[PDB]
Amino acid sequence: KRTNYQAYRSYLNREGPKALGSKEIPKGAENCLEGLIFVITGVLESIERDEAKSLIERYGGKVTGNVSKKTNYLVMGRDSGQSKSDKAAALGTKIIDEDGLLNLIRNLE
């Protein structure tokens, strides 16, 4: 019984942002993420977690690391944690990619 998976920290923070400052921060509606809880897990394409978090928070969303019952959208990059995914799955919380996160906001442009 170990709840900290050291291997996961390696994967989740092993990103090679070559498109950092390219896909980031759209001009969507300020209300787009407002009232929606976003949970970011796994390694995305290229995003510093804070830029995601600040973005989510800025657009009225709450960013948290644990999938809640009001999440709706689980941003999942490369990680295979059954633990976080199962909760989302049981709720019907849909899994999205980095592109998916921005895709919603891009729609509100």
Swiss-Prot record:
Domain of life the protein comes from: Eukaryota
Q: Where is the BRCT domain?
A: 28-106
Report, as the record phrases it, the tissue specificity of this protein: Wide tissue distribution. Undetectable in placental tissue.
Between which residues do disulfide bridges form? none
* TM helices/strands, residue ranges: none
Its annotated compartments are: Nucleus
Instruction: Quote the disease note of the record.
Output: Cerebellar ataxia, neuropathy, and vestibular areflexia syndrome: An autosomal recessive neurologic disease characterized by imbalance, cerebellar ataxia, impaired vestibular function, and non-length-dependent sensory deficit.
Q: Write out the function statement from the record.
A: Subunit of the replication factor C (RFC) complex which acts during elongation of primed DNA templates by DNA polymerases delta and epsilon, and is necessary for ATP-dependent loading of proliferating cell nuclear antigen (PCNA) onto primed DNA. This subunit binds to the primer-template junction. Binds the PO-B transcription element as well as other GA rich DNA sequences. Can bind single- or double-stranded DNA.
Its quaternary organisation is: Large subunit of the RFC complex, an heteropentameric complex consisting of RFC1 and four small subunits RFC2, RFC3, RFC4 and RFC5; the RFC complex interacts with PCNA and the interaction involves RFC1.
Q: Which family does it belong to?
A: Belongs to the activator 1 large subunit family.
Put simply, this protein is called Replication factor C subunit 1
This chain's source organism reads Homo sapiens
The shown residues of the full protein are 375 to 480 of 1148
